[PDB]
Amino acid sequence: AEFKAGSAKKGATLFKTRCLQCHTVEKGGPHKVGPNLHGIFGRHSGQAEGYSYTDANIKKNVLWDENNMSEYLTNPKKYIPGTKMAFGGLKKEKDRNDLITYLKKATE
Ligand code: HEC
């Protein structure tokens, strides 16, 4: 199914274990391997200030919402062929819902 609100509490733990190694969520957080995700929802892909993306990520030009984020996070490389995000995906729909619920709030 499409996105449905889950548990931000569980999503934060998922973020810590699966994402935090490469990403920050806070405005002005440290620079990492992946782009700062502050403000990601409602922004097009490839637009974080001062980050060097693949051409693939820029050219996809997806306007990130909670539904296409769930599709992307299922399998990043299938959604954006050639992306340099070294992440196979979140297989479980419940995990995607929980993570995205946390991410939507934490990146405000
Ligand atoms: C490093 C080992 C990473 C892990 C673990 C995760 N991400 Fe990532 N992400 C990473 C890179 C290097 C990039 C840039 C990709 C490119 O081709 O240029 C990304 C990109 C994203 C994006 C897109 C951001 C945009 O502005 O378009 C998102 C939304 C994203 N990453 C989210 C994300 C989440 C939620 C993770 C855990 C589940 C995660 N990433 C892991 C590097 C790495």
In the chain, what are the domain boundaries?
Answer: 1-108
Q: What is the resolution of the experimental data for this entry, in Å?
A: 1.5
Q: Is 19 one of the annotated binding-site residues?
A: yes
Helix axes 93-106 and 66-74, enclosed angle (nearest 10): 130
Count CA atoms within 13 Å of residue 53 on its CB side.
17
Is residue 106 within 6 Å of ligand 1 at its C-beta? Answer: no
Contact assessment for residue 54 and residue 84, using Cβ atoms and an 8 Å cutoff: yes
Residue 91 carries which side chain, given as an amino acid letter? K
**Ligand 1 atom 17 nearest Cα:** 83
Method of determination used here: X-ray
- CA neighbor of 86 nearest in space, from 78, 77, 94: 77
Look at residue 63 and give its three-state secondary structure. Answer: strand
Count CA atoms within 13 Å of residue 89 on its CB side.
16
Which residues is 44 bridged to in the sheet? 63
- CA neighbor of 103 nearest in space, from 46, 41, 54: 41
- Both tokens of 107, joined, read 């990146």
- Taking the centre of ligand 1 as the mean of its atom positions, its distance from the CA of residue 7, in whole angstroms, is 21
Distance CA 20, CA 5 (A): 21
17, 21, 23, 92, best to mutate for ligand 1 pocket (most atoms within 8 Å of CB): 23
Q: Is 22 one of the annotated binding-site residues?
A: yes
Could you tell me the sign of the dihedral formed by the alpha carbons of 53, 96, 61, 64, in that order? negative
Is residue 76 within 6 Å of ligand 1 at its C-beta? Answer: no
Distance CA 44, CA 23 (A): 17
- CA neighbor of 71 nearest in space, from 79, 81, 63: 79
